[model samples]
Target: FVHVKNPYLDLMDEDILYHLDLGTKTHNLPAMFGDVKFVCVGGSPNRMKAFALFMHKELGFIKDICAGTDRYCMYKTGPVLAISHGMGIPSISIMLHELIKLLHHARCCDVTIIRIGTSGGIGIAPGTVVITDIAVDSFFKPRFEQVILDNIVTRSTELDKELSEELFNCSKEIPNFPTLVGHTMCTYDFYEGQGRLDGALCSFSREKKLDYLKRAFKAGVRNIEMESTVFAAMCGLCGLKAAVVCVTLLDRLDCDQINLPHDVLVEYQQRPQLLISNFIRRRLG
Candidate 1:
């Protein structure tokens, strides 16, 4: 019997092939060059395509896709995109522990990361987009004994810094984006972690489920999603660059009603999904 803080999560599932050893999954890491270029990460097959659409077709990147975990459109551009699904924070951390060590072992220290994921909104309406400055994690146990975050320990990005610069200039010259919001939560599981209906099944206590996340939202989280905070934390600890942008599907502020389909790609600035493409185009050109 395996004991976990959250029993419902299928991650630690004891299904019989011996939970002790989860079959070693091998991955090929991209080799380092002069600098760590761009990276795009998504959660599902369609999302992997979405990221690829921006990288390859939008940007028209023709050659030289560095080695990575997959042949899945990762070859469209460099670092071949992470697109690791079902990879929550803790998993991301463990993966990082080995992968980062491998990278350092390979002597590739320069890397930049960006995560594109889907989420259900917390305070805002569904379909709202958020580019977060900070991602806080409340679901997982702190890696170290003393988990006190004195500004340095917590994973936060200068996304507010970067996005603010873009929004400020764009709003002045182009449209009125006004820079949407500040924070978001990276969860262990989207369904219960962010408070969603279990397809008519009562899997989680409504109030208890909402407790930690709601507090984070009220503390200025504009959105809720899983993965970024852990990624950010790991990156922050080891000196890597990372950030999260999420698309809101359902609003948890109310009854966790179902609204959008899972296939949609969220664009937070309402600037359209073309921006990522354009950025890619400029990168390759």
Candidate 2:
């Protein structure tokens, strides 16, 4: 039997996931996705689409099931669903809400969801993949403060412990690239929120920027991005196994600007994809 939970989902009789162009009324979710076992999400539509096509090749698809909308993109290859989630907490949060509901209505069993993206490394080198053990705020607090109607509720941003170790172990099978299990700091903005001096409004000095980042590194944060905490929170509440795997675009300790060549940047983007592809292979095997 399938097991999943969703808040405010019972309100809809047909439960139209407008963002995804999926509705319980128009589509038979169970018949279409009941066998789904894996879900992969990322920030860019093109990247997600590429990952879907690559996964289509890796998993050996007879035909393509790729589909998309203005809000989101989706590709179903075998048991895996590759989709783009745009950027930041709000965007991914909405997508996840619908996705969890989709899974619930479809009665998907033993489904695993993963967020693969890019991040700025703390003390680690560029191109290294950080498997998030916990998602933290700028203050280094491992909690997602969700805003409700009248009040705020704090949700623990803890990720699956075993899955992180499995990912780290899987990296050992690959060559050259470095991977670690650590806390990922999620911020609201990439400019000021991330302590970058290049932002239009820079209220802090270079020294202050270094100080805050140093403190974050001291707090066990190996990388920084805009998602993960809410991803951890929402997935945890739904009892879905989830993980965040992000490749470092650049070392924040060294520089804020990602000045890598276009070719290098493209290669960096594929690091997490490669790692995930291998992990999925092992899991399927």
Candidate 3:
């Protein structure tokens, strides 16, 4: 079984996964989620629901498991649990806390979790898929600075290296799109935090933005997104083998805004799903 390191949980009478609309006493968690072996999370509910639908066609799936609440969307098809984490680090952090507890309550074992989402590329092509080997911060550091109470605690953002390589190899079988293993820089915001000058507030010059982004690229960050560092850190602490796979919507070096056509953008969003479905299918087989 997956072990939750916190001993305090044992003393709790009924643990409520409030955000998930689930509780140990109110629902039979073990029976509902015990069989889950793979978990996929992203930033958007619609996208995750779409992914679940795609999986329904592929694995031949379900209504939202978190239908009781609108905080997040969750669907289970076979051994895979598809969920949405909203947007950034704090959003994903809450989801992961509840999710990890859910898994522990379910008595699940040997599970692998992956985050499939979209990002802005540092120097790579717009459609390129990046499998994160290390999830870094805006400062180009491979660590997650979690503020606990009044103290700042640092956590490692190293993902599953072998799983990352396995996903990379799986990409080779798919063909057409580009996939590579590299560092993913996780930031706090989408605009200014990512060095974009198009936001409502811009404190830096265009040259400063370019220089910062170029330095990030030089430091081995292939893509920039909002959640991977916390995702990696939380999952690692709870013993879940995790990976982050994101498709770059646009190259930040070229432009800040994503100027792709609607259809092209839709296609780009499906790239990570295609790769992950293939990986899950292979793993199940």
Best by lDDT: 3
lDDT for each residue of candidate 3 in 101-155, tens digit (9 for 90 to 100):
9999999998999999999998899999999999999999999999999999999
Q: Order the candidate numbers by TM-score, best to worst.
A: 3, 2, 1
The reply for model 2, stretches above 4 Å from the true place, is 1-12, 62-68
Residue 64 of model 1 has an lDDT of 22
Q: Is candidate 1 or candidate 3 better by lDDT?
A: 3
TM-score of each: 0.62, 0.95, 0.98
lDDT of 1 by residue, 141-178 (tens): 32222144654443333343554344233333324332
Q: Which candidate leads in TM-score?
A: 3
- Please list the C-alpha lDDT of all candidates, in the order they appear: 0.50, 0.89, 0.93
| True lDDT of residue 134, candidate 2 | 97
Worst 10 residues of 1 by lDDT: 15-24
Q: Mind giving the per-residue lDDT tens digits that candidate 2 earns over 1-285? A: 334464556676778887888889989999999999989999998898899888888876522333546888887888888888889999999899888888899989988899999999999989999999999998999999999898999999999888888889999999888888999999998899999988888899989999999999999999999989999999998888889999999999998889999999999999998998898999998
| Model 3 weakest lDDT span, ten residues long | 53-62
Question: lDDT for model 3, on a 0 to 1 scale?
Answer: 0.93
User: 218 in model 3: Cα distance from truth in Å?
Assistant: 0.8
Model 3, residue pairs in steric clash: none
